Write a protein that binds this ligand. Sequence first.
Ligand SMILES: [Ca+2]
Ligand SMILES: [Ca+2]
Length: 646
Amino acid sequence: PQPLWQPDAQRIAQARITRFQAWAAEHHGAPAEGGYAALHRWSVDELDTFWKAVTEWFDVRFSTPYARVLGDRTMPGAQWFPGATLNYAEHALRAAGTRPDEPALLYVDETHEPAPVTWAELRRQVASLAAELRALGVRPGDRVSGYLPNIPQAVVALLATAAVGGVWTSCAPDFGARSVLDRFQQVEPVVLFTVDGYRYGGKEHDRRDTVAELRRELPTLRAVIHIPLLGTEAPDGTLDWETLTAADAEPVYEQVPFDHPLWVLYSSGTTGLPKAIVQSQGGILVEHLKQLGLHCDLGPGDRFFWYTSTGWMMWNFLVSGLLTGTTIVLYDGSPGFPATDAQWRIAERTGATLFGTSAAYVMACRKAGVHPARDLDLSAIQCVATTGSPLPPDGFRWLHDEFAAGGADLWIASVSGGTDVCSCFAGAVPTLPVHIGELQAPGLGTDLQSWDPSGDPLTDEVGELVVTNPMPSMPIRFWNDPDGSRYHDSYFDTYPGVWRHGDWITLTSRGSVVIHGRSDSTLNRVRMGSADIYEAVERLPEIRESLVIGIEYWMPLFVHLAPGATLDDALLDRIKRTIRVNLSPRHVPDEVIEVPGIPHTLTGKRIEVPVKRLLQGTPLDKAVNPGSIDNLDLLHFYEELARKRS
Ligand SMILES: [Ca+2]
Ligand SMILES: [Ca+2]
């Protein structure tokens, strides 16, 4: 297997993860030799010592000592650092004591004119707001909610919430009221931070009526804090943001147990109410430190820009950049406004050193004839990362060569972040080569395996992604989950005591990971992942997006066509051809059906399972939570299809 890219030996030697291994080998019995393969095996075989090592390396300061690193090891509900106390916000703001006048936040909107908030100023605003939250009666454990775009106020609010031991939960303001309420009503927040609207694509999006509706339908709220993004007056009964952040009193951080809830995230699952996933201050603290400082190589003074809505877990990951003393870049706006290269212009104007984006955006830039490294000053960029669908080899080459032609050797990273543990089970390692369509390795401390139906491990064979050991950022539990039934059914109902993620994967002999698709959405004719098929079909110019389903056996391919394209015999021939060639005859659809579009979750994930149910005759009204999908009418198309075929 020929790598797309191999890191040079000095880059390897200079990686923080390499320094960590050397230090761990001196002080904690880690292997000095053997590189990542050896470090990883140690991180799993000596799990307690590994996490101890992580906390020392990052100087996590427990205000009360832990009794041990790990008590009960069984899942779900493993017992991390029992006895210890800490505070996430306190750790995040440590750099205010070391480089107070450096920028902690660089924020920007569609004017593309960045503004800084210094570490000292961030610490002060957070302390002011935390004191106000305490005065409003927010106690440790109370939920504090936000209806907020990616603006510096959202970071200040989250940190202030964590500082008081409040439990953060948020939605972005492109969510409609039913989607927001389906989430927030489950956890009964006592505070709401909210904007009056936002700007996107050069257009104004008023949210005053939505805010009025949220307030009326959330009767547990006791205080509402208004952020006048569009410059409107605070509604009756609300507090004005600027009045709460202006004080200069001593920072105070609530020292909470390791397991104390930090935030509630919401699953993208489309059945029933969205799962309300609770993660701990301690678990997120150590896992995000590990990912950011070791897997992403981030440290003090770096500048981390991920293009993201606050409604995606990548925002939470971005916020945690502060934990490593890293400046974070916040952009509230469209990815292509005023022009296609907008995200690159932000990276330029903020001096980003790590720029995280989507493979789709990279490909769209290449297609549009953008040359970002040539035309902008991207000399500060050391790494470009994508999460979600993998960057194809022509995209990787373009990106790398675009920087390489100008004398820069770029690290192109592929990660796979998920809401469930607010991190990745597998993804990037700065010291390993990159291969087509692979995630480089399971993360440190993650015992990832591919299991057959009998629960035995496979190598170079497709199987179920399992994680056989506990990770600190795994959910404490789901909120609004009697008996813990939904949490159990989500991961623990297939192999006892083992986390089964629902991904159909290969774990290669080189220790890397290929994700073929969702296990519950495979095509069985031999069990095939749908991802492989989407890659092939969707390379065709005429096909904007596709969706493949298999039902007991009928295997139709739904295609949303590019403008001007027509589903003719020639097109059907090209479709079937590219499939039987690049994959196999088994992969060829029984039928191709043109569609007005492809329905998605709110986060833009394909919804194969709900569509399958519809095609199986389940009425739309009972198949999905409509607040959890992006286009009701598009989904109704598929119900009509089943009705027509009934
Ligand atoms: Ca347990
Ligand atoms: Ca295409």
